[PDB]
Amino acid sequence: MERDKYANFTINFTMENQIHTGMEYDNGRFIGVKFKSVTFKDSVFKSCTFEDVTSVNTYFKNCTFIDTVFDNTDFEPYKFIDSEFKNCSFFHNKT
Amino acid sequence: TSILSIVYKKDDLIDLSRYGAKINIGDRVYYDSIDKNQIKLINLESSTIEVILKNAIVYNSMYENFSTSFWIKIPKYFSKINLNNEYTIINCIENNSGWKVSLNYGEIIWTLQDNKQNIQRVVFKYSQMVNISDYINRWIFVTITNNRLTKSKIYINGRLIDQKPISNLGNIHASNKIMFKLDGCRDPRRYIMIKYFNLFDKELNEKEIKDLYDSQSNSGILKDFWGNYLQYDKPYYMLNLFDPNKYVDVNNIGIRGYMYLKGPRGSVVTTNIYLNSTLYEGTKFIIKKYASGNEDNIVRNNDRVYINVVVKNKEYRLATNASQAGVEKILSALEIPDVGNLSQVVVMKSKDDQGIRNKCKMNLQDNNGNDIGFIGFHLYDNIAKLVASNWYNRQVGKASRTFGCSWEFIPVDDGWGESS
């Protein structure tokens, strides 16, 4: 009944048409990723880094982000629905 | 007027007042290397300052008026352990009467307690949900006055903030000791910095409070964003006060490149605890000593300097060709040995022509001493290039409002907590 964990990874591929629920991502790097039609639900991101990311029709719903950085992403506030942040940072936003 | 005036002397604290208060300092009290009057107290029982007042000046009265002033720097509160947790910091309460200063999330609190254990409090509140805060982790001047027939009043940076009637309070019999100590703070990493604690035997008036503020501000010395002395040979991130949503960038090195204001500036967040712009962005500036004959490392009003700009970990020189056409002179980052006779001397300003303290300005001059202009910015095809422009100086000379030539210098500080 814990969340399924995925840790110490680097994702650098196009992720599309998929829903991830009840996941815990720890020390994960999302670098050079395009998200299209992706939703993370009820998931936790600890010490993750999103870097150079674009997202279309992509959301984080009821997710918790801790010690997480969003660098050179297009993640605007509307992409986070009912979510929360603990000691996170956004910078170099796209456009 | 003064009945206790604590200053730094010789790896120690002393009282300048006539009453010669005894001061016992614990193991783990620290003085800042640059300004030794800035005292750091940490969250340990050994980080204490105990001031023993002579009996003659112990507060014991229904009627005597009294005030206190001091400067304080309070780190940002980062997490839920900091919510809803009042902790005493300066304590003169004995047998449940006296006064104290305490803190809490976004608050500075003053408490009076009489000998029936009646209490009145005044509070300063500040938000952590602001892009750029005037208060979080910055030096703030606090003044609290008490008139036994009227009100307790709290001033912040000379400005009246909160006031409450205290004619409900009877005899207040405070302690003969003041204890400076974090007391009841559940965050093990919490600290404070304080400077220039004073006690006065009257209700200070507005003018007295403003003069204290102006006086103790050192307005001939430039300050960094945190309120510390601005320093030579120290990396600073630059904030343009008129457009705080950008940071400084350089498109290319050399006289065909230019410095400009790039956005958007980022943010740091903890849901419902803080939400602020990131401060550690852009090409850092390093102020280099040029004409000052002052042997210390502090930057003073009217110091003539050079500005080094850091671009990918290498230092270049901020300069322009004042012969370029137009009042606005676009600034470039040049190889330090290629500067030649380009204009690069900067006059650092902490105050205007009539001696009024104000935000940092940089007046670029040529090598004949002619002003080329305060450094601000101008839009060239939607790009906000840094310029020196004498229009700014003419506006300053007329007392007019300027826009974009006022800057803050931000060094990395452990009370702010962002990563660099």
Numbering used by the authors:
A (entry chain B): 473 to 567
B (entry chain A): 876 to 1295
According to the publication:
Botulinum neurotoxins (BoNTs) are among the most toxic substances known. BoNTs block the release of neurotransmitters from peripheral nerve cells and cause botulism, a deadly paralysis requiring respiratory assistance. HN transports the LC across the cellular membrane, while HC is responsible for anchoring the toxin to the neuronal cell surface, by binding to both a ganglioside and a protein receptor. BoNT/B, BoNT/G and BoNT/DC utilize synaptotagmin I and II as their protein receptors, while BoNT/A, BoNT/D, BoNT/E and BoNT/F instead use synaptic vesicle protein 2 (SV2).
To understand how residue differences within the receptor binding domain of BoNT/A1 versus BoNT/A2 may impact their receptor recognition properties, we solved a high resolution crystal structure of HcA2 in complex with human SV2C-L4. Our structure is largely the same as the recently reported crystal structure of HcA2 + SV2C-L4 complex, but our structure offers a higher resolution (2.0 Å compared to 2.3 Å in the previous report), and revealed a different position of SV2C-L4, resulting from a significant rotation and shift of SV2C-L4. The final protein model contains one molecule of HcA2, residues 876–1295, and one molecule of SV2C-L4, residues 474–567. The C-terminus of the right-handed quadrilateral β-helix of SV2C-L4 is bound to HcA2 by forming a continuation of the β-hairpin in HcA2 (residues 1141–1151), with an interaction surface area of 474 Å2. In the crystal, the N-terminus of SV2C-L4 forms a crystal contact and packs against the previously determined ganglioside-binding site of the neighboring HcA2 molecule in the crystal. This crystal contact is most likely the reason that Sialyl-T (ganglioside headgroup), present in the crystallization condition, was not bound. Also the rotation of SV2C-L4 causes the distance between Lys955 of HcA2 and Glu556 of SV2C-L4 to go from 3.4 Å to 7.2 Å and thus preventing formation of a salt bridge. His564 from SV2C-L4 forms a salt bridge with Glu1156 of HcA2. HcA1 uses Arg1294 to form salt bridges and a hydrogen bond to Glu539 and Ser519 of SV2C-L4 respectively, interactions that HcA2 does not possess since Ser1294 in HcA2 cannot reach those interaction partners. In the structure presented herein, it may interact with the C-terminal carboxylate of HcA2 (Leu1296), where only an acetate ion could be modeled due to the lack of electron density for the entire residue.
